[PDB]
Please model this.
Amino acid sequence: ILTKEARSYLVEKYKELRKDDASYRITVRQLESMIRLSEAIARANCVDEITPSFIAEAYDLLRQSI
Amino acid sequence: ELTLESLSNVKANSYSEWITQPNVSRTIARELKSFLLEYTDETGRSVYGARIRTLGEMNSESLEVNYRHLAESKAILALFLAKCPEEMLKIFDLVAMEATELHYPDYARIHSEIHVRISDFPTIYSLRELRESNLSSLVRVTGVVTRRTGVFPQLKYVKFNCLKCGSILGPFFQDSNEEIRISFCTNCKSKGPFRVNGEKTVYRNYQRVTLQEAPGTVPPGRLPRHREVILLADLVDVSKPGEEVEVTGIYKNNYDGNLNAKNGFPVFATIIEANSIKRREGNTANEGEEGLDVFSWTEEEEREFRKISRDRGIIDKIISSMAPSIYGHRDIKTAVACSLFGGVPKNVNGKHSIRGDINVLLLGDPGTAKSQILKYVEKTAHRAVFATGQGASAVGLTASVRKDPITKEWTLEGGALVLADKGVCLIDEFDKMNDQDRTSIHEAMEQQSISISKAGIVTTLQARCSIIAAANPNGGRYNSTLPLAQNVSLTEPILSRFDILCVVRDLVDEEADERLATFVVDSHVRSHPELNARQRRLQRQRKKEEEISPIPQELLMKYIHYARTKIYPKLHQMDMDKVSRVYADLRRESISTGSFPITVRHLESILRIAESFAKMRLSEFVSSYDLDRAIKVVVDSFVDAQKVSVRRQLRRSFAIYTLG
Amino acid sequence: ERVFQISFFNLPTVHRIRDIRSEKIGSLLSISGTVTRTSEVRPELYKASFTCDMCRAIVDNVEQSFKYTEPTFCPNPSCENRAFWTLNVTRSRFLDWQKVRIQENANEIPTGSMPRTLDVILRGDSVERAKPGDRCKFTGVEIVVPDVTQLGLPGVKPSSTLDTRGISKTTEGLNSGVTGLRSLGVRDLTYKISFLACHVISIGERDQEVFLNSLS
Amino acid sequence: DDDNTEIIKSFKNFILEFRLDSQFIYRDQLRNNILVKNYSLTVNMEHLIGYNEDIYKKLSDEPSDIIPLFETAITQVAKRISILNSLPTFQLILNSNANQIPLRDLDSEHVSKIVRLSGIIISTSVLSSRATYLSIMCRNCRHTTSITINNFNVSLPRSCLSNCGPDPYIIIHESSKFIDQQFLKLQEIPELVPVGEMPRNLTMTCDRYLTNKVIPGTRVTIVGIYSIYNSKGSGVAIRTPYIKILGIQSDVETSSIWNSVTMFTEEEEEEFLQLSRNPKLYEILTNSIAPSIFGNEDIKKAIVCLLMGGSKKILPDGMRLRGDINVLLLGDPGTAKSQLLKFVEKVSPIAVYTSGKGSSAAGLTASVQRDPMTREFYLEGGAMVLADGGVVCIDEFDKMRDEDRVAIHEAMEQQTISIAKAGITTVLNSRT
DNA sequence: TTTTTTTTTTTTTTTTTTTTTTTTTT
DNA sequence: AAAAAAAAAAAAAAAAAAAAAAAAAA
Ligand SMILES: Nc1ncnc2c1ncn2[C@@H]1O[C@H](COP(=O)(O)OP(=O)(O)OP(=O)(O)O)[C@@H](O)[C@H]1O
Ligand SMILES: Nc1ncnc2c1ncn2[C@@H]1O[C@H](COP(=O)(O)OP(=O)(O)OP(=O)(O)O)[C@@H](O)[C@H]1O
Ligand SMILES: [Mg+2]
Ligand SMILES: [Zn+2]
Ligand SMILES: [Zn+2]
Ligand SMILES: [Zn+2]
Model:
C-alpha cells in the first residue's frame, strides 16, 4: 500500500518530470508506470509498506530511459 | 402431521421418495406457503406480496424466487430443492398459484398455472466440468447461444383410443424429451391400435437451443464444448442467436440408439431443461447484484425515482455521476449523458420519419481516458456492443447471408449494429479503419435501417442504434493553429451525421497537472483491494461510493432505463426565433471562416438535446432552460473546434445567445 | 457402494503402437503415444435396473457388455414375459466415459510412413487426464470390440448400418466375418482392436497462509 | 346427422330470409354470381351476428366442422333459385373487422380458431391438384365405388366392400374431379418486428377461387384458421403450424397476371375524369410529392414524370423502344436526397428500395438455386425482377462495387436479363 | 501508402418409394 | 398353413454464390 508521504513525493516527481519534458512524451501513463515500478520494488524487499526511497528508485529508472 | 425439525430425518433411502410421500408433501406445501407469505427483508416489507401484486398487473405467468432468501430461512427446503428439482417444483408452482389467488381471485380465467423461476443459485458450473454425479439435479451453466430451432406446439396431456374395445386412456403427462409409450389396455386386455385422440387437447410452446462455451471461459487454444437446452412455454424467444446467456436448469439423460451404435458402448445422451434465463451480453457488473434482470425496477424504486426527479439540479448530479473516477472533461460527460438518455423519434402523418438518437465523436490526444469512458458507457448501457479498428468488417457491423445447415436456404444473420438495436454501439480507434468498412454505417446512422439484396433475399432491417466513436488526429496530436478539416481524414458525409464533437487537447499547466496527479493517486489508494458480514461488505462498498458519486450506480442504471422506457416529452411552447437566428448565424460563420459542415441536419440536434435534457428531469414537456442549455452545448461544441486566431472573435460574436 | 478401480503402473517393458497383435488380447500392457483428439465425458450404463410391465417386479444389477441388454426371465416364475421392460434410470448406476485417439511418436515413425492410429478408452477417474498434443503413456488391457449394429440393437435408429460414405471395395469380403450365431441371424459379425486404459501418465494463488502450508 | 340437418336448415333460412330495407342482398348475390359463372358467396360476419348469435357462436368454436355445412347450404339454395346439374360445391369467403393479431403473438392458445392478421407475401408456389370426387374399383371383385372429399382437414378404405387383399382399391382417374391448390409464404410487417429479432415467416394454403390473387412483395390482410399438421426435428410430439386462407384483402388491384383491364367501378372513373379536367392538376400533383420537404420543385416535377412514364412502341422490324424514365441525384449531404427515395417507394403501387452497399449482381438481376429435394437448378428473381412494371430506388449508388454496378446496363435500356448458367439459357423480361 | 487486384474455401447428405423379399403370429 | 407387420434399397455431387484473408500496384 502507499503511505502519506509517498503520495506527496509521487505528485512532486510527476510535476517535475512534466516540467522537464516541456506534453509530447509524458502523460498520466508515466505516473501509473512509476506507481507500478514502486510496488514491484516494494514486493522485491518483502515489505507491505512503500517508502519514498522506492519512488526515488522508480523515478531514476524512468529517467534513465528518457 | 410433521414439523420442520422432523423433515431432517429421512427414510426410504432416497430423497425423491421421501419428498413424494403424502404426509411429507403436506408439510412441505404449508412451509412453502408460510415462506411466501411471511418473509420480510431488513426494511420490513414483504417482497413476494409485492411481486404477486405486480404479476397480475403485468398479466405475467411466472414468479421469481431468490435462492438466498429460501436458504437463509428454511434451509432444509433449500437443500431439497437443490437435490430434487422436479418434485419440488410441482408443489411450489401449486402453492404459488394458491398464494396468487389471494390478491387476484378469479385469476384462473387469465392463466391456469403459475411457473416459478429460480434465481441466484450459489454454485456455477462450466460445460467442461459436468459429470454423471450432477444427473437429475439443478445446475447453473453459462454459455453462448448458437442456433435456435423455432417455436412449435407440443402436446401436454396425451390421450389414446383403442378401436376393438373403443377404450379411451387417461391423460398422460409427456416428458417433453421421451415419447409416451403405452401398450397395455385396462379394458381391451390385449394389444390394440392406438390413435392420438384427434382434437380436444392442450398444447404448450416448445423450442430448442444449443449452448457453446464462451470464448473467455475456454482455455486458450482448446476446442469448445456444447450442450442442448429445451425451452418451454413463457421462455421461448427470450434468448437470441449470438447472445451470451446464463441458464439454470435440470441435467437429464436419455437412451439413444445411434449413440450406442457408433461409439460401441451403452452410453447415454444428455440434455438440459431450462428453468431460468439471465442475459450477460455486455454486462461486467455480474460480479455483484441479485436477480434475473438488474435493469428492472420495483414500486418503491419507481417512487424513489419520482422523489429524486423533482430536486433542482438533478441534471448537474447526473452529469457529475458519469465516470466519477475520471477527473475533468465535463463536456465529454455531458455529451455522454445526452447520448445515453437520448431523444424522441417522430413520424409525421405516417410518411415522414425523423430519427431521435444522438451520436458522439471524441477526437483527442493520446492518454486522455477516452477508452475508459467508452468502457464505462458499455457497462452502464442496457444493450451495448463494442468494436475496434481492423477487427470489424463490412458485414460484421451489418447483416450477413449464410446457408442454413438444416433448411439449406439462404438466410440472414445478425451483426453488431443489429445486436445493439435500441442500444449503443461503440467503435474505438475509428480512424484506423478501412473505408469500405467505415462506409457501411452510413445508412444506419441516419435512416436507422439496413437494406440487403443478396442471393434472392430482398429485405430491410431495423437498427435504432446510437454511435459513440473515439479517434486520433493526424500525426497522433491536434494542431490548434489549423482548421478541423486538415486534422482528420474523414469527409463531410460522415462528419455531418455526428451530433456532438469533443476535441480533447493536452496542454502544459503546473496546477492542472498537480490536481490530476493528486486525484489519480487518491484513486489508486481507494481501489487497492486490501450483523452478517455479507452486509458489512455492502456498507463498506457503499462508503467508497459516497465520496465521488452523488448517486449510486445501481440506482442510476434503473433510473436511465425507466426514463428511456416511459417518458416521451414534447415541444409545444418554445422560442422559434432564437433557434432560427442561431442556425442562420452558425451557417453564416462556417463558409466565411470554418471547416465544420453545418446543414439542416444540425438544426434538429438542438431539439434532440433539448428533449434529452427534458428526459433527465422525468418531465413530459420541454421548458426554456433545457432549450437554452442545448443551444449553449451546441455553440460551445462549434466554437472550440476553430483556429486560435478567430476563436476569440467567434466566442464574443456567439455570446449574446447564451446570456444565462 | 463405491465401484472400485485398480490402477497398475511401472511395468517392466513398454510397447509401441505397431507391436499390437491379436495374440495379446486380454493381457495387461503399457503403450506410449501422442494424443490427437478427445471427446466429451459421457455417462456409461454400469448396473441396470428394470421393472416388469405387468408384475411391476424390480430387477437390478443387470450387467451389460457392449449393447443395451434387458433381462429375460421375470423374477416370479408365475409371470411369463420375455420383453417390454422399463429402465429405472434413477436407480441405475452410471460411470464416466471418454474416447481418445492417439498416433505414433515422431521417432518411431519410419522415414516414409502414414501414422498408425488406435482408440483408447478412459473410464472412471481417468477422464480428461490426456490432452491433445501431449505425449502420454497409457497402461491397461487390450480388448476387441464387435460391431453392435448388426447384433440387433432395439431401436430402429441404427436402421441396419446407415452410411454416408462408401466402404472400401478392397476389403469387401476380405474382412473375415463369422456367422452361425442365432442373434446375428444370417449376418456376419466383425471385430476390431481397441485399448482400454486404467492408468495414464505424461512423458512429453496469492494467499500467504495456504502458501506456507505446502512447503516443508 | 340429427344436428347437421338442423344446422343446414338454419344456414338456408339465413340465406333466404335476411333482409335490409327492401332487398334480399344474399339472395341476389347468389343469382348474380351464377350468371357470370362465379360459384362462391361472400358473407359479412356482422350480418350473421345481427341475424342470430347462436349461429355465430356455433361457427366461432368449430370452424372446420361447421363451414362445410354452410358450403352445402349455399349450393342447395343455388339449385332452388337457379334451376327448375353441373353445379359444383360452392365456396364461402368471409369478411371480418376484429382486431388484427401479430404473427409473433400466434401460439398454442390460438389453435383451431379463426384469426385475422396482416403481412407481406414473399413467394407464391405453383398450382397443384386435389381430388374431390374419387371413382374407385377393387382389384379382385371389380365393382364400382365412389368417394366424396372436402378439403377441410382421409384415405381409401382399408377393407373390401361388395378373398381380396388387405386394402385393395385403385383410383379410376378418368371420371374423377379435381380442384386447384396453392401455397403462399408470409412475413411480418417490418415495423412490428421486436427489438433485435429477425423477421419470421409462415405458410398458408389457398383453394379454388383464392388462387392467383397476390404477387410477391404485396401487403395483404388475411382471414383464416390457425391449424397444425403432423409430418416429418428431433423433438417429441411436435407439429408444424400453418394457416388455411378464407379471405384475402390486397392493396394493389393487380391480380397474379395483371390482366391490364379496368378494376374501377364507374363511381371511381367519374372521379378520375373529373380530376383530369382540373386546369391546375400539374401543380396539385407536384405539391403532393413529399409535403414535408421544402423547395426542390424541379426534382418533384421529375419524380411525377417518372411516376407517370412515357409510351412504348413496337416496330415492324422487331425493334423495341424504351418507355421508362431514369433519374440520378448527385448532390451534397443534408439536401433531402434520401427522404424522396423512401417517399417514391410508398407512393408507387410497385416499388423496391435497396442500398448499393449491401447489394450484389445476383441479388439485383436474378439468381440460380438448387432444390434440396429434386436436386436440379432453377431461377429465382431479384430486385429488378420483383420491381417489374414499377420503380427501383438504389441508394448509396456511388458505393456500389464496380462488378455489381455493371450488371444493370442491359436491364436499364434493353429491359431484359439474359442468364446462361448451369444448363439454363433464358431471357427474362424486366421493365422498371 | 491506400488503393485496387487476387486465390480459395466449405458450402454439400434427412431423404423415397411401392414392390419384392423376409420374420413373426394367430 | 395362413395372416399382418417391417423394414432394405438409397446415392452424390458438380456448379454457383458469399466472405476473408494473403499479394499485387497509381
Ligand atoms: N483524468 C484522466 N485523464 C486521462 N487519463 C486518466 C485520467 N484518470 C485516469 N487516467 C488513466 O490514464 C490512462 C490512459 O487512458 P486511456 O488508456 O483510455 O487513454 P487513450 O489514449 O484515450 O486510449 P486509447 O488509445 O485506447 O483510446 C488509463 O489507465 C486511465 O485510467
Ligand atoms: N429541404 C428540407 N426540408 C425538410 N427537411 C430536410 C430538408 N433537407 C434536409 N432535411 C432533413 O435533413 C435530414 C437528413 O436528410 P437526408 O437523410 O435525406 O439526407 P441526404 O440528402 O440523403 O444525405 P447524404 O448525402 O448524407 O446521404 C432529415 O431529417 C431531413 O428531413
Ligand atoms: Mg442519404
Ligand atoms: Zn384395447
Ligand atoms: Zn412379470
Ligand atoms: Zn374386393
User: Anything to note?
Assistant: The CA atoms of residues 76 and 139 of chain C lie 44 Å apart. Residues 156, 159-160, 166 of chain C lie near DNA strand F (CB under 10 Å from a C1'). Chain C touches chain B at residues 40-45, 53-54, 64, 66-69, 84, 87, 89-90, 94-97, 99, 121, 131-132, 145-149, 153-158 (CB under 8 Å).
